[PDB]
Amino acid sequence: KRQVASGRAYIHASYNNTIVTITDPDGNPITWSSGGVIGYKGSRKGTPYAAQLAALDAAKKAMAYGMQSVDVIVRGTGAGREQAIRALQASGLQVKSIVDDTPVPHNGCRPKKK
Amino acid sequence: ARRRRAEVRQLQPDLVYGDVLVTAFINKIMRDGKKNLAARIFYDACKIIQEKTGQEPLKVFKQAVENVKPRMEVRSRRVGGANYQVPMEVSPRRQQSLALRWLVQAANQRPERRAAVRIAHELMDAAEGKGGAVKKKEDVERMAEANRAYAHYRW
Amino acid sequence: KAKVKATLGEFDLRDYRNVEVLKRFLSETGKILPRRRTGLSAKEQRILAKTIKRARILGLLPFTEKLVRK
RNA sequence: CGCGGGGUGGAGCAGCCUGGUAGCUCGUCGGGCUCAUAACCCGAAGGUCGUCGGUUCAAAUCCGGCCCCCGCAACCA
RNA sequence: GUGAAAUGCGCAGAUACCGGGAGGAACGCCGAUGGCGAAGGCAGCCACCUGGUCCACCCGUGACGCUGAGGCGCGAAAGCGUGGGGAGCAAACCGGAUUAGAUACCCGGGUAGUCCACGCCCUAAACGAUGCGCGCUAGGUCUCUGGGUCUCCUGGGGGCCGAAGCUAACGCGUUAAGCGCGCCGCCUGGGGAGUACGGCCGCAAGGCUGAAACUCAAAGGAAUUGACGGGGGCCCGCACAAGCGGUGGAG
Ligand SMILES: [Mg+2]
Ligand SMILES: [Mg+2]
Ligand SMILES: [Mg+2]
Ligand SMILES: [Mg+2]
Ligand SMILES: [Mg+2]
Ligand SMILES: [Mg+2]
Ligand SMILES: [Mg+2]
Ligand SMILES: [Mg+2]
Ligand SMILES: [Mg+2]
Ligand SMILES: [Mg+2]
Ligand SMILES: [Mg+2]
Ligand SMILES: [Mg+2]
Ligand SMILES: [Mg+2]
Ligand SMILES: [Mg+2]
Ligand SMILES: [Mg+2]
Ligand SMILES: [Mg+2]
Ligand SMILES: [Mg+2]
Ligand SMILES: [Mg+2]
Ligand SMILES: [Mg+2]
Ligand SMILES: [Mg+2]
Ligand SMILES: [Mg+2]
Ligand SMILES: [Mg+2]
Ligand SMILES: [Mg+2]
Ligand SMILES: [Mg+2]
Ligand SMILES: [Mg+2]
Ligand SMILES: [Mg+2]
Ligand SMILES: [Mg+2]
Ligand SMILES: [Mg+2]
Ligand SMILES: [Mg+2]
Ligand SMILES: [Mg+2]
Ligand SMILES: [Mg+2]
Ligand SMILES: [Mg+2]
Ligand SMILES: [Mg+2]
Ligand SMILES: [Mg+2]
Ligand SMILES: [Mg+2]
Ligand SMILES: [Mg+2]
Ligand SMILES: [Mg+2]
Ligand SMILES: [Mg+2]
Ligand SMILES: [Mg+2]
Ligand SMILES: [Mg+2]
Ligand SMILES: [Mg+2]
Ligand SMILES: [Mg+2]
Ligand SMILES: [Mg+2]
Ligand SMILES: [Mg+2]
Ligand SMILES: [Mg+2]
Ligand SMILES: [Mg+2]
Ligand SMILES: [Mg+2]
Ligand SMILES: [Mg+2]
Ligand SMILES: [Mg+2]
Ligand SMILES: [Mg+2]
Ligand SMILES: [Mg+2]
Ligand SMILES: [Mg+2]
Ligand SMILES: [Mg+2]
Ligand SMILES: [Mg+2]
Ligand SMILES: [Mg+2]
Ligand SMILES: [Mg+2]
Ligand SMILES: [Mg+2]
Ligand SMILES: [Mg+2]
Ligand SMILES: [Mg+2]
Ligand SMILES: [Mg+2]
Ligand SMILES: [Mg+2]
Ligand SMILES: [Mg+2]
Ligand SMILES: [Mg+2]
Ligand SMILES: [Mg+2]
Ligand SMILES: [Mg+2]
Ligand SMILES: [Mg+2]
Ligand SMILES: [Mg+2]
Ligand SMILES: [Mg+2]
Ligand SMILES: [Mg+2]
Ligand SMILES: [Mg+2]
Ligand SMILES: [Mg+2]
Ligand SMILES: [Mg+2]
Ligand SMILES: [Mg+2]
Ligand SMILES: [Mg+2]
Ligand SMILES: [Mg+2]
Ligand SMILES: [Mg+2]
Ligand SMILES: [Mg+2]
Ligand SMILES: [Mg+2]
Ligand SMILES: [Mg+2]
Ligand SMILES: [Mg+2]
Ligand SMILES: [Mg+2]
Ligand SMILES: [Mg+2]
Ligand SMILES: [Mg+2]
Ligand SMILES: [Mg+2]
Ligand SMILES: [Mg+2]
Ligand SMILES: [Mg+2]
Ligand SMILES: [Mg+2]
Ligand SMILES: [Mg+2]
Ligand SMILES: [Mg+2]
Ligand SMILES: [Mg+2]
Ligand SMILES: [Mg+2]
Ligand SMILES: [Mg+2]
Ligand SMILES: [Mg+2]
Ligand SMILES: [Mg+2]
Ligand SMILES: [Mg+2]
Ligand SMILES: [Mg+2]
Ligand SMILES: [Mg+2]
Ligand SMILES: [Mg+2]
Ligand SMILES: [Mg+2]
Ligand SMILES: [Mg+2]
Ligand SMILES: [Mg+2]
Ligand SMILES: [Mg+2]
Ligand SMILES: [Mg+2]
Ligand SMILES: [Mg+2]
Ligand SMILES: [Mg+2]
Ligand SMILES: [Mg+2]
Ligand SMILES: [Mg+2]
Ligand SMILES: [Mg+2]
Ligand SMILES: [Mg+2]
Ligand SMILES: [Mg+2]
Ligand SMILES: [Mg+2]
Ligand SMILES: [Mg+2]
Ligand SMILES: [Mg+2]
Ligand SMILES: [Mg+2]
Ligand SMILES: [Mg+2]
Ligand SMILES: [Mg+2]
Ligand SMILES: [Mg+2]
Ligand SMILES: [Mg+2]
Ligand SMILES: [Mg+2]
């Protein structure tokens, strides 16, 4: 919420954008970022380079709150998933452990027209 | 170039400095096969280089041409149906040919009357890292980064 | 690599309680492991699947393990 | 009639906070890409930041009067 | 969110993350070249009720068999009636985009419906486009499921390859489209037409039975060759790209 060294980062990989939410080890967010926050609009928010800058920026912001250690959690498939991850550990942030939690139904709700 | 790959044409060194770079640079100045005139205008400037600064025109040329070497450019790869302007490497071949071309192109852009007086100034400001030829370089490099997103298409 | 059938000793596969036995079949992520790698035959593969499902319902077995470190 | 907050580039607007930043958007010009058209990208020209005075080393920023607009409330023999 | 966008949503605090709660629908992995059913169809798990089917033992009846007009029952989806349910999706509908237009393909919204009960509707590319039963005519391999001391033997299904043979060809070939017999249904040029009339059924939508006038000299199946494609593979040309110089402007 305000001051903790350990924590966790959340990758969210859409196909038209990528966001990242760093939170305390409880769940409550500290800060976040995304392709749009970075500067891009539309398709480019999907770009892997944007995703790179998102994780980077989200990291820098967390760095200030005293963040140093984070377990990464990813959901999505967008071209930027691993790039957010790669950009995370390379951000001097401690990547304790990357995890995949991308939801998927055991057959329930009918999808869109696609 | 669908077949082979084309041999990068070879070139007889300078009849003075013994530099192939200068030989090539002359050709860019050359108008309508009049190679003689071109060399003339060049060397006239070459001496003018020293007339202004105690430095010899040798490294003035290298220093200049090296500051107009664009590190990376934007090539438009028309894949995915759309034409994306991807930023990527500049072949060592291009960096030279482009530099020299921009050099002379920007030189001709200068206002001053005599042609050799332009090659001199443009060459000086270039090594000084200030010339208008450098301006095209600073551009192509920025134009490359203003699109670093799509760089994930780098082939 | 290593068939899951031989990897274990003699065992009943209608037993929906010897989690230690069953747990070995249940993938890295709780997914009922493919027959083409459990070494099981048609009839046995079926009875297994049914008992696993039973266990999961009793809470003994998982429905989904998260993919760790990737 | 009293009270309230506005004037900044060709147009809309942040900055006013609390003094050292005039920015953004589209628009105009050149360039890049384009079947075309936008989208995207590069660069560029353009603002006494209403007026006149005042404190200040330095304000469009704080002050006084005023011009004009917008709004609030009231009155109308 | 898309090709890119826009409509839309968001400082009245959205997206992303965590916790608690509500509700409907559908059942991941197992899952398949799989299984069951007469067909339509049937997938989480449990229990109950119930149909069909296959194997063994050689036990029982003694031709009691086959087909089957009409009848009767079943019959995906959509649709209809009464009442209930409503998360997601989504005809109609509204908006955005694209375009010459775009009553569409894409996007943002969204109702009936999709779900349940009872009752109608009765159609389909209800397709193996192949009626049911029986007997007879090489094998190779793959798999599902029964029985037997079991590198195998023997029944019952599910695919492929293929004897003979059949076929206009494509192809079928013990799961026949081969060789035969019984029985039912159906066809007789294309269009007009599954239309009209009559009848029968239905709440309605509509369904069943089902012509003629007129008109055409073809409609049609399979296969051959080539041409073509906003099909693919390999390969090439100043075809693009890279680069230099030009016409289009002026006389
Ligand atoms: Mg974009
Ligand atoms: Mg996109
Ligand atoms: Mg939709
Ligand atoms: Mg080649
Ligand atoms: Mg195109
Ligand atoms: Mg070269
Ligand atoms: Mg699996
Ligand atoms: Mg008054
Ligand atoms: Mg008054
Ligand atoms: Mg007054
Ligand atoms: Mg007030
Ligand atoms: Mg200043
Ligand atoms: Mg800017
Ligand atoms: Mg203008
Ligand atoms: Mg336009
Ligand atoms: Mg823009
Ligand atoms: Mg001034
Ligand atoms: Mg001033
Ligand atoms: Mg003044
Ligand atoms: Mg008003
Ligand atoms: Mg007031
Ligand atoms: Mg008054
Ligand atoms: Mg009045
Ligand atoms: Mg646009
Ligand atoms: Mg919306
Ligand atoms: Mg606010
Ligand atoms: Mg929850
Ligand atoms: Mg929740
Ligand atoms: Mg609660
Ligand atoms: Mg509800
Ligand atoms: Mg629930
Ligand atoms: Mg319910
Ligand atoms: Mg269901
Ligand atoms: Mg499956
Ligand atoms: Mg498989
Ligand atoms: Mg099947
Ligand atoms: Mg069924
Ligand atoms: Mg059922
Ligand atoms: Mg019962
Ligand atoms: Mg039964
Ligand atoms: Mg039975
Ligand atoms: Mg006997
Ligand atoms: Mg007997
Ligand atoms: Mg007996
Ligand atoms: Mg007898
Ligand atoms: Mg007897
Ligand atoms: Mg008979
Ligand atoms: Mg009879
Ligand atoms: Mg009849
Ligand atoms: Mg009958
Ligand atoms: Mg009935
Ligand atoms: Mg159904
Ligand atoms: Mg229905
Ligand atoms: Mg319906
Ligand atoms: Mg009514
Ligand atoms: Mg109803
Ligand atoms: Mg209910
Ligand atoms: Mg209702
Ligand atoms: Mg609903
Ligand atoms: Mg919807
Ligand atoms: Mg409406
Ligand atoms: Mg509108
Ligand atoms: Mg519309
Ligand atoms: Mg058109
Ligand atoms: Mg119109
Ligand atoms: Mg409409
Ligand atoms: Mg609705
Ligand atoms: Mg209706
Ligand atoms: Mg249901
Ligand atoms: Mg119910
Ligand atoms: Mg009910
Ligand atoms: Mg009735
Ligand atoms: Mg029905
Ligand atoms: Mg019929
Ligand atoms: Mg079929
Ligand atoms: Mg048959
Ligand atoms: Mg038959
Ligand atoms: Mg044999
Ligand atoms: Mg084999
Ligand atoms: Mg067997
Ligand atoms: Mg024996
Ligand atoms: Mg069958
Ligand atoms: Mg089958
Ligand atoms: Mg067989
Ligand atoms: Mg033959
Ligand atoms: Mg033949
Ligand atoms: Mg065959
Ligand atoms: Mg045989
Ligand atoms: Mg036989
Ligand atoms: Mg056979
Ligand atoms: Mg025959
Ligand atoms: Mg006729
Ligand atoms: Mg006819
Ligand atoms: Mg006829
Ligand atoms: Mg009929
Ligand atoms: Mg009819
Ligand atoms: Mg009909
Ligand atoms: Mg009649
Ligand atoms: Mg009738
Ligand atoms: Mg009738
Ligand atoms: Mg009736
Ligand atoms: Mg009826
Ligand atoms: Mg009646
Ligand atoms: Mg009724
Ligand atoms: Mg009605
Ligand atoms: Mg009628
Ligand atoms: Mg007749
Ligand atoms: Mg007829
Ligand atoms: Mg003819
Ligand atoms: Mg044909
Ligand atoms: Mg033939
Ligand atoms: Mg053709
Ligand atoms: Mg392909
Ligand atoms: Mg090729
Ligand atoms: Mg060219
Ligand atoms: Mg011309
Ligand atoms: Mg000419
Ligand atoms: Mg001409
Ligand atoms: Mg012309």
PDB file of C-alpha atoms in Angstrom, chain B residues 19 21-22 49 53 55-70 95 99-100 103 120-131 133-134 137:
ATOM      1  CA  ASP B  19      42.336   6.868 -50.544  1.00  0.00           C
ATOM      2  CA  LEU B  21      36.993   6.923 -50.053  1.00  0.00           C
ATOM      3  CA  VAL B  22      38.061  10.157 -51.772  1.00  0.00           C
ATOM      4  CA  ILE B  49      40.519  23.168 -45.557  1.00  0.00           C
ATOM      5  CA  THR B  53      42.397  25.598 -40.002  1.00  0.00           C
ATOM      6  CA  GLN B  55      44.544  20.876 -39.753  1.00  0.00           C
ATOM      7  CA  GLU B  56      45.203  18.782 -42.866  1.00  0.00           C
ATOM      8  CA  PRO B  57      42.151  17.908 -45.002  1.00  0.00           C
ATOM      9  CA  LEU B  58      42.822  14.194 -44.446  1.00  0.00           C
ATOM     10  CA  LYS B  59      41.264  13.579 -41.031  1.00  0.00           C
ATOM     11  CA  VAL B  60      38.889  16.475 -41.678  1.00  0.00           C
ATOM     12  CA  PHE B  61      37.335  14.259 -44.343  1.00  0.00           C
ATOM     13  CA  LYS B  62      37.289  11.122 -42.195  1.00  0.00           C
ATOM     14  CA  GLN B  63      36.044  12.933 -39.088  1.00  0.00           C
ATOM     15  CA  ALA B  64      33.325  14.586 -41.160  1.00  0.00           C
ATOM     16  CA  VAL B  65      32.193  11.537 -43.108  1.00  0.00           C
ATOM     17  CA  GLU B  66      32.187   9.523 -39.875  1.00  0.00           C
ATOM     18  CA  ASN B  67      29.766  11.941 -38.206  1.00  0.00           C
ATOM     19  CA  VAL B  68      27.361  11.602 -41.128  1.00  0.00           C
ATOM     20  CA  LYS B  69      27.353   7.808 -40.858  1.00  0.00           C
ATOM     21  CA  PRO B  70      23.760   6.966 -39.850  1.00  0.00           C
ATOM     22  CA  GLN B  95      26.644   4.197 -44.259  1.00  0.00           C
ATOM     23  CA  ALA B  99      27.112   9.816 -45.996  1.00  0.00           C
ATOM     24  CA  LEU B 100      28.984  10.857 -49.127  1.00  0.00           C
ATOM     25  CA  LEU B 103      27.477  15.301 -47.882  1.00  0.00           C
ATOM     26  CA  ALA B 120      34.992  22.853 -47.831  1.00  0.00           C
ATOM     27  CA  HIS B 121      32.490  24.430 -45.440  1.00  0.00           C
ATOM     28  CA  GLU B 122      30.126  21.463 -45.467  1.00  0.00           C
ATOM     29  CA  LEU B 123      33.103  19.200 -44.796  1.00  0.00           C
ATOM     30  CA  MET B 124      34.260  21.376 -41.892  1.00  0.00           C
ATOM     31  CA  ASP B 125      30.885  21.696 -40.178  1.00  0.00           C
ATOM     32  CA  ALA B 126      30.473  17.953 -40.719  1.00  0.00           C
ATOM     33  CA  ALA B 127      33.643  17.030 -38.830  1.00  0.00           C
ATOM     34  CA  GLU B 128      32.616  19.746 -36.399  1.00  0.00           C
ATOM     35  CA  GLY B 129      29.337  17.850 -36.093  1.00  0.00           C
ATOM     36  CA  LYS B 130      27.110  20.759 -37.037  1.00  0.00           C
ATOM     37  CA  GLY B 131      26.626  20.687 -40.808  1.00  0.00           C
ATOM     38  CA  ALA B 133      24.470  16.946 -43.862  1.00  0.00           C
ATOM     39  CA  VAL B 134      24.599  15.881 -40.235  1.00  0.00           C
ATOM     40  CA  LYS B 137      21.749  11.959 -40.183  1.00  0.00           C
TER      41      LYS B 137
END
